[PDB]
Amino acid sequence: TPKGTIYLTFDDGPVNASVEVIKVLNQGGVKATFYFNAWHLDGIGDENEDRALEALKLALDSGHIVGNHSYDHMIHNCVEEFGPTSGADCNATGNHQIHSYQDPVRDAASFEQNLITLEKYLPTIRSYPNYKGYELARLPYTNGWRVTKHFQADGLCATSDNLKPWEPGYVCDPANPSNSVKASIQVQNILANQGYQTHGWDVDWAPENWGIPMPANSLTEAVPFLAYVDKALNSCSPTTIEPINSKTQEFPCGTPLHADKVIVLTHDFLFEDGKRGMGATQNLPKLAEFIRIAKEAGYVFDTMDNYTPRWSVGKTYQAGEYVLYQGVVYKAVISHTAQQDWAPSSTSSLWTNADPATNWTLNVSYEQGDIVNYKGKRYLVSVPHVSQQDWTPDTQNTLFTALEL
Amino acid sequence: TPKGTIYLTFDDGPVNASVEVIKVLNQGGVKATFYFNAWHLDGIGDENEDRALEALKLALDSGHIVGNHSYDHMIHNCVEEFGPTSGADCNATGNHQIHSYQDPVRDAASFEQNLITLEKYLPTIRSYPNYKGYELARLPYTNGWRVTKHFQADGLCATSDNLKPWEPGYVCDPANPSNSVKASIQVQNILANQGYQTHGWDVDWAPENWGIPMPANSLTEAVPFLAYVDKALNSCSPTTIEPINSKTQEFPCGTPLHADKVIVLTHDFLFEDGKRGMGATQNLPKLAEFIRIAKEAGYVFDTMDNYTPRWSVGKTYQAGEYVLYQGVVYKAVISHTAQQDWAPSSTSSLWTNADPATNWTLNVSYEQGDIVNYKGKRYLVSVPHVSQQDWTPDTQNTLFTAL
Numbered sequence A: 001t002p003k004g005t006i007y008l009t010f011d012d013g014p015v016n017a018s019v020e021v022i023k024v025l026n027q028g029g030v031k032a033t034f035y036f037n038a039w040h041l042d043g044i045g046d047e048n049e050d051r052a053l054e055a056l057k058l059a060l061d062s063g064h065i066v067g068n069h070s071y072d073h074m075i076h077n078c079v080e081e082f083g084p085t086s087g088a089d090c091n092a093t094g095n096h097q098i099h100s101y102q103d104p105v106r107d108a109a110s111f112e113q114n115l116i117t118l119e120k121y122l123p124t125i126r127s128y129p130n131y132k133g134y135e136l137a138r139l140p141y142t143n144g145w146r147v148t149k150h151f152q153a154d155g156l157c158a159t160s161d162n163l164k165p166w167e168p169g170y171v172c173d174p175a176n177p178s179n180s181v182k183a184s185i186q187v188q189n190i191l192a193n194q195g196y197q198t199h200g201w202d203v204d205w206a207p208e209n210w211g212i213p214m215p216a217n218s219l220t221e222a223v224p225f226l227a228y229v230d231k232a233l234n235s236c237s238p239t240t241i242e243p244i245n246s247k248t249q250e251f252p253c254g255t256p257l258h259a260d261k262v263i264v265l266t267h268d269f270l271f272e273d274g275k276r277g278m279g280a281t282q283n284l285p286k287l288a289e290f291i292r293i294a295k296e297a298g299y300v301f302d303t304m305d306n307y308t309p310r311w312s313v314g315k316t317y318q319a320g321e322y323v324l325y326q327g328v329v330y331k332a333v334i335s336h337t338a339q340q341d342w343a344p345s346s347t348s349s350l351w352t353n354a355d356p357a358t359n360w361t362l363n364v365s366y367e368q369g370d371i372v373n374y375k376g377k378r379y380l381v382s383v384p385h386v387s388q389q390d391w392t393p394d395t396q397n398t399l400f401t402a403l404e405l
Numbered sequence B: 001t002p003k004g005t006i007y008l009t010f011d012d013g014p015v016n017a018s019v020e021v022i023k024v025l026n027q028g029g030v031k032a033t034f035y036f037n038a039w040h041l042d043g044i045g046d047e048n049e050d051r052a053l054e055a056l057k058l059a060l061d062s063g064h065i066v067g068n069h070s071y072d073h074m075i076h077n078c079v080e081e082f083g084p085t086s087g088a089d090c091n092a093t094g095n096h097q098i099h100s101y102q103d104p105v106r107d108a109a110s111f112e113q114n115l116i117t118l119e120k121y122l123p124t125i126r127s128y129p130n131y132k133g134y135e136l137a138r139l140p141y142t143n144g145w146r147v148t149k150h151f152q153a154d155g156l157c158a159t160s161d162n163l164k165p166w167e168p169g170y171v172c173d174p175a176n177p178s179n180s181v182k183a184s185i186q187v188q189n190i191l192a193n194q195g196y197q198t199h200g201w202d203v204d205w206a207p208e209n210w211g212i213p214m215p216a217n218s219l220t221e222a223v224p225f226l227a228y229v230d231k232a233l234n235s236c237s238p239t240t241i242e243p244i245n246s247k248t249q250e251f252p253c254g255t256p257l258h259a260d261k262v263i264v265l266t267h268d269f270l271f272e273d274g275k276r277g278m279g280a281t282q283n284l285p286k287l288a289e290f291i292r293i294a295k296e297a298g299y300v301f302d303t304m305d306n307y308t309p310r311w312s313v314g315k316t317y318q319a320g321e322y323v324l325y326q327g328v329v330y331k332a333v334i335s336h337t338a339q340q341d342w343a344p345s346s347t348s349s350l351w352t353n354a355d356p357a358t359n360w361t362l363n364v365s366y367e368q369g370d371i372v373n374y375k376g377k378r379y380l381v382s383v384p385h386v387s388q389q390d391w392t393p394d395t396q397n398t399l400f401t402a403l
C-alpha cells in the first residue's frame, strides 16, 4: 500500500508544448489535470499555440482531466482595453500580478466564457467524462481553495494593488489584504455558488532562478523535486511555501481530505524550447524521471476529479468522511457500507450537503454564525439545524435572522 | 380534482411592460414562467427597456420562474454584423424568421451568454430557487421540445432559408426541413447535453390580426381565449396550431407528461401602450379577467419548473411515470412509495435516467438502435441494456458498435 498520492497539475494550456508533455505522461503511465485558458485557441495568448486544438483533443483522448483556469488568465485586468495584443502587452509590462482582479462579477464570468470557447472549438467536449471544465477550476495567480464547507482558504497576498511582490517596497499584510485579493475571494465564492470546486497547490515545480537567461533550464531536477514532495507530504506546505504570494495562510492544517496527498503545480510552457529556454530538451526528461522514481518510492498518481473520492457502491465510509457525487459534496452522518439505493442526496439522512458554497441549500448542517444567501438577501443562522424544503430563511424567523443591506 | 393545469409563459422580456404584467399576475394569485432575453438589460433590444432590471428583480421577488430564451433572440443571424442597432435593423426588415439559425454551436452559445449577462446585472440571481435560466429554455420562433428521452419533437417549419410562410411559392416539408430548422434541431441537442429542458406551447395568445393600425388591441379576449384553451386541452395542440411555423408535427400525442395540461405562450410587449398599440389599457384587463374566469372554470395555474413533477417523499409512483430531481429526469422502474434515503440517482434501482440527452450517461435504459456520444465518437446501441460505470461504449463491443 502506497506512501501517498501525487496530483500533477499543469496550468496555462493548451499550447504547442502541451503535446509533448502529454505524450511523456502517457509513456510514464499516469494521468494528470490540466487547468486551461481557452484564449490560446483564439491565437491571442502570446504563445506558440497553433497546435492548441490538437493539444486539447489529445489531452482528452488520453484520459487526462481538463479544468477551468478562466478564459484569458485575467489579462483583461492587466490592460486598459482587452484585444488580440493584450497578452503581448501584459508580458511587456510584466504586470500580471498587479490589479489582477477588479470586478469580481466580470472576472468570474471569465470562467463561463472559458466554457463557451472550449465548446466552440471542440463541440463534442461534453461527451468526454474527463472533461471537468464546469466543475473544477483554479484561480490565476492564486493559491486558493474551495473544496468543502469546512475546507476553504484564500491566497491573502496572491495579487497586489501596487508593486510586484519582488519589487523593493512591496508590503504584504494578510490581515488587511489588497483590493485585488478581496476581489479574488469574491470570485471564489461566485464560482462555488455555480458548483465549482477550486484547488491550490502544495508545491510549485518552477525555475530555480527566474532572473537568468533561459530561466526554464533551472527547473528543479527530478530527485530533489521528489525530496520537496516528500517534505510536503502531511506538512501543510501551503502555509510555508515560498514566495509570499504563493502562500495559503489560513489553510486548515490537518484537514482529512488533504492527508497523504501532494498537489504539484507546473506550467506547460516550462517544457518548450523557446523564449524561456530549452524547456523541451532539458525538462521533458526530468518529468519522465520524476514519474519513474516517484512510483518506485511508493507514490501513486491520480487526478483532481478524485481528490475528493467519488461515491462508490460497496465501499465503507466512516462518520465524518467526505465524498463527491453527481457534482455535489457530501459528509457521512454515520459509518456504513454504501449500497445501490443509498446514494447521497438532498433528502438522505445518512449524508449532509457539504459544498463550499454560500447559497442556502437543502440538507446542509448549518452552524450558528453561518451566513447564507437567499432570494437576494443575506441571513444569519441563529440555530444549528439541517436545512429542508419548508425551512427557507424568509419563513423561519427562529432559525434565521435577516441582515440589513 | 382540477379540470386541468395552465402554464402561462411570457417570452421576450424583461422590458418595461413586464412590470405591470407581473403585478396583474400577483393580484390574480398566480405564478408564471418568463423566458428572457438579457440583451434588453444592455439596452439594445429595440424596446422600452430602461426598467428592465427592475422588472427582472420583480419577477424573481414575486416568485415567478425565470428561463432561458437566449441573449439576443438570434438577432445576430438577422443581420450581417451584430451591434447596438441590430434589433432595430431586424425589426425594420422583418426578416426574423429567415436564416434564424446558422451555426448551431454559436446559436447555442447565445443561451449561455444569456446566463452571463443575467448574472452580471443581478449578481445575487443564483440565490433565487425560482431562477431556472440554466435548466429551462425555449428556442426563439420554435415550438420545439426536449423533455424526456421519449418526449422530444422539433418545430420542423419554424424557420426558413428563403421565403416567409405567407409568401407565394412557400412550401413546408416536415420530412425535408430547411437548413435553419436543421440548425435549430442541433441547438436543441446541444442544450440538452448541457442539462437543459426545452418546451414549446399549446396555444399562442396573440393579436387576432397584425395588419390593423393598432394590432396589439386585437389580442383575443378572455372568454374566447378560454375557449381556445378548452379546445386545446387533451387534443394535441402542437400538431393543429396555426400558423404552420408554430406547428410541432411529430409531437407525441397522448404522452403522459402532456395530459391535462395547457401551455400558454404570449409576449410581455403585447401589454404596453406604445408602438404596437394600447397594450396596457386594452390587454391588462383581458389578462386579469382570464385568470379569474379560468380558476372559476376549474383550472389551476402552475409554472414550468413543475411541468415535470418534482420527486417528493411519501408519494406513490407507478412504473413508467416521470419525475424531476436535482435537474435530472427520471422514470420509475416499478410501482413504489418514495422514501427519504432512496432518491432517484445514477445508481438507484427504483429509477432510470431519462434525460432528453444524447451523450452517454449512467443508469439510462438504452434501447437497440439508440445512438450515444462518447469521447468524440458516436456509438450505436447494439444490445438493449441499462448503463453503468464499467460499461463504457469504447470497451464494450457487445453493447455498443462504433459508427
Ligand code: NA
Residues within 6 Å of the ligand: A135, A195, A196, A197, A327, A328, A329
Ligand atoms: Na459541484
Ligand code: NA
Residues within 6 Å of the ligand: B135, B194, B195, B196, B197, B327, B328, B329
Ligand atoms: Na437538467
Ligand SMILES: [Zn+2]
Residues within 6 Å of the ligand: A011, A012, A073, A140, A141
Ligand atoms: Zn496561470
Ligand SMILES: [Zn+2]
Residues within 6 Å of the ligand: B011, B012, B069, B073, B140, B141
Ligand atoms: Zn421570443
